[PDB]
Design a protein around this motif. Structure first.
Motif, PDB file in Angstrom:
ATOM      1  N   UNK A  22      14.114   0.724 -12.719  1.00 31.37           N
ATOM      2  CA  UNK A  22      13.711  -0.641 -12.406  1.00 31.37           C
ATOM      3  C   UNK A  22      12.403  -0.599 -11.619  1.00 31.37           C
ATOM      4  N   UNK A  23      11.366  -1.287 -12.089  1.00 30.02           N
ATOM      5  CA  UNK A  23      10.144  -1.542 -11.322  1.00 30.02           C
ATOM      6  C   UNK A  23      10.042  -3.038 -11.039  1.00 30.02           C
ATOM      7  N   UNK A  24       9.864  -3.398  -9.772  1.00 23.36           N
ATOM      8  CA  UNK A  24       9.689  -4.774  -9.314  1.00 23.36           C
ATOM      9  C   UNK A  24       8.233  -5.030  -8.898  1.00 23.36           C
ATOM     10  N   UNK A  25       7.654  -6.117  -9.409  1.00 23.95           N
ATOM     11  CA  UNK A  25       6.245  -6.498  -9.249  1.00 23.95           C
ATOM     12  C   UNK A  25       6.144  -7.935  -8.727  1.00 23.95           C
ATOM     13  N   UNK A  26       5.325  -8.233  -7.711  1.00 24.76           N
ATOM     14  CA  UNK A  26       5.268  -9.577  -7.146  1.00 24.76           C
ATOM     15  C   UNK A  26       4.710 -10.599  -8.145  1.00 24.76           C
ATOM     16  N   UNK A  27       5.028 -11.880  -7.944  1.00 25.80           N
ATOM     17  CA  UNK A  27       4.556 -12.963  -8.811  1.00 25.80           C
ATOM     18  C   UNK A  27       3.025 -13.143  -8.752  1.00 25.80           C
ATOM     19  N   UNK A  32       2.873  -5.416  -2.854  1.00 28.62           N
ATOM     20  CA  UNK A  32       3.984  -4.627  -2.293  1.00 28.62           C
ATOM     21  C   UNK A  32       5.079  -4.270  -3.322  1.00 28.62           C
ATOM     22  N   UNK A  34       7.960  -2.336  -5.522  1.00 28.62           N
ATOM     23  CA  UNK A  34       9.199  -1.646  -5.126  1.00 28.62           C
ATOM     24  C   UNK A  34      10.023  -1.323  -6.373  1.00 28.62           C
TER      25      UNK A  34
ATOM     26  N   UNK B  30      11.549 -14.306  -5.661  1.00 30.54           N
ATOM     27  CA  UNK B  30      10.365 -13.441  -5.856  1.00 30.54           C
ATOM     28  C   UNK B  30      10.630 -12.250  -6.795  1.00 30.54           C
ATOM     29  N   UNK B  31       9.575 -11.495  -7.128  1.00 33.99           N
ATOM     30  CA  UNK B  31       9.562 -10.283  -7.969  1.00 33.99           C
ATOM     31  C   UNK B  31       9.961 -10.444  -9.448  1.00 33.99           C
ATOM     32  N   UNK B  32       9.003 -10.191 -10.339  1.00 33.16           N
ATOM     33  CA  UNK B  32       9.210  -9.841 -11.756  1.00 33.16           C
ATOM     34  C   UNK B  32       9.829  -8.447 -11.828  1.00 33.16           C
ATOM     35  N   UNK B  33      10.664  -8.149 -12.829  1.00 38.31           N
ATOM     36  CA  UNK B  33      11.255  -6.814 -13.004  1.00 38.31           C
ATOM     37  C   UNK B  33      11.128  -6.300 -14.430  1.00 38.31           C
ATOM     38  N   UNK B  34      10.713  -5.044 -14.555  1.00 37.12           N
ATOM     39  CA  UNK B  34      10.710  -4.266 -15.791  1.00 37.12           C
ATOM     40  C   UNK B  34      11.727  -3.135 -15.693  1.00 37.12           C
TER      41      UNK B  34
END
Ligand SMILES: Nc1ncnc2c1ncn2[C@@H]1O[C@H](COP(=O)(O)OP(=O)(O)O)[C@@H](O)[C@H]1O
Lengths: 55, 34, 221, 97
Positions: A22-27, A32, A34, B30-34
């Motif tokens: 799982x890679x989480x990317x901000x909107x 930051x 995670x 918050x946060x998009x996820x792949x």
């Protein structure tokens, strides 16, 4: 070229088969990022909470 | 009437015993996820 | 309690009956403090169960000195005494015998003696008593002025230094013949007399009372 | 206050490998029987104070094994301690043994 300096590099490695990531990317944000990663062997498996430079 | 002569001791004495106890139990532990 | 602990206890009871101060110089790891605990509970003469008492100790032992009185006999009214001024002093407003044994340390006692002399004690317990080895100290000059019938010195092996530090613990136990060093240096021969000064008020064992069960130290330089 | 919780986590747990003590704050009555072994990184100028500190590990509760190490410089100055310790050890025996 004819004087050798000999160095033992001893290090710890993780050697595994990826189960899931799982890679989480901000909107949009400051960036930051995670994430989490999971690895397996024929005997054992585990989850790693990932750091920013690892990602 | 007569009870206040004792209350002036015992109202303080129950507080002394309690304060001694709550001191002593520290003092013994918050946060998009792949 | 193992039988040797009871044997040492009855020797302390003989010094109690004789009114003699002394050194509990049995080996370490044997129940050093435990051989003092039974002084309260063992005697049928009642007074030892309900009297006022005081302990002086090195500061790092201000924990097992109360935990022992949660397992060996949990019945005792025991009061610890250390902390910031109003952590410590305020406990004197609670006890103002109504509470039995007080636990203390040498840094406090040398300042607080003026408060402690407001209460009498039956017996004095003095732990790691080699803290008193310097008769020049403000500590020893004040600790001589506590009030009891008996003073018992506990040590992790006593003395073991030159004659300048023999005097203070012996003098703290007995003033008799302890006027000056000159005859005491005369009292093989000199050591045999110094031994017979100590032996009526000091115990010895060698660790074989427990090295039936325990193996050696492996010691390395 | 602090001297309690560090002892209470070192006794009664297997969570810690090692403890650091001064010869004089640690040396008296703490009874760390959870320890199997001791290293004197320094010996004291007053002899037998090290031995008095060794015995705050060495006692009956140690079911497994017992060891003690001294680490000393080759003759630079710390030899004067082992000299004066072995020298005073005769006096320090003959008062009790
Ligand atoms: N009730 C008991 N049952 C078994 N052993 C006991 C008991 N009471 C004391 N001991 C022994 O006491 C030893 C610890 O002694 P301690 O209280 O710390 O005094 P000391 O300072 O002489 O070492 C432990 O090894 C323990 O086995």
């Amino acid at each position: 070229r004819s004087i050798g300096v000999r160095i033992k590099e001893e290090t710890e490695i993780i050697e595994g088969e990826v189960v899931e990531i799982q890679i989480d990317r901000p909107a949009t944000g400051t960036g930051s990022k995670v994430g989490k990663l999971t690895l397996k062997t024929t005997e054992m498996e585990t989850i790693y909470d990932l750091g920013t430079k690892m990602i | 009437l007569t009870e206040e002569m004792l209350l002036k001791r015992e109202e303080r004495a129950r507080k002394r015993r309690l304060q001694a106890a709550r001191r002593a139990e520290e003092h013994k532990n918050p946060m998009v996820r792949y | 309690l193992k039988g040797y602990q009871l044997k040492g206890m009855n020797w302390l009871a003989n010094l109690y009956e004789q009114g003699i101060n002394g050194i509990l110089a049995d080996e370490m790891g044997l129940g050093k403090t435990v051989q003092s605990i039974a002084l309260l509970a063992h005697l049928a003469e009642r007074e030892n169960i309900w009297g006022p008492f005081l302990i002086i100790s090195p500061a790092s032992t201000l924990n097992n000195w109360h935990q022992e009185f949660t397992r060996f006999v949990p019945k005792f009214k025991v009061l610890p005494y250390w902390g910031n001024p109003h952590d410590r002093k305020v406990i004197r407003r609670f006890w103002s015998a109504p509470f039995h044994v007080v636990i203390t340390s040498y840094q406090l006692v040398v300042q607080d003696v003026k408060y402690f002399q407001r209460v009498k004690w039956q017996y004095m317990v003095l732990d790691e008593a080699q803290a008193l080895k310097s008769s020049s100290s403000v500590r020893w000059k004040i600790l001589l002025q506590f009030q009891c019938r008996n003073r018992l010195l506990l040590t992790g092996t006593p003395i073991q230094n030159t004659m300048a530090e023999l005097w203070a613990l012996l003098h703290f136990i007995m003033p008799t013949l302890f006027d000056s060093h000159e005859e005491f240096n005369e009292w093989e021969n000199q050591l045999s007399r110094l031994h017979m000064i100590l032996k009526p008020f000091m115990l010895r064992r060698i660790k074989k009372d427990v090295e039936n069960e325990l193996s050696d130290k492996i010691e390395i330089l | 206050s602090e001297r309690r919780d560090m002892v209470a986590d070192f006794q009664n747990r297997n969570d810690i490998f090692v403890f650091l003590l001064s010869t004089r704050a640690g040396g008296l009555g703490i009874n760390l029987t959870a320890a199997d072994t001791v290293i004197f990184y320094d010996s004291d100028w007053n002899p037998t104070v090290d031995q008095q500190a060794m015995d705050r590990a060495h006692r009956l509760g140690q079911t497994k094994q017992v060891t003690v190490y001294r680490l000393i410089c080759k003759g630079t100055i710390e030899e004067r301690i082992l000299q004066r310790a072995k020298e005073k050890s005769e006096i320090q025996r003959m008062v009790i043994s």
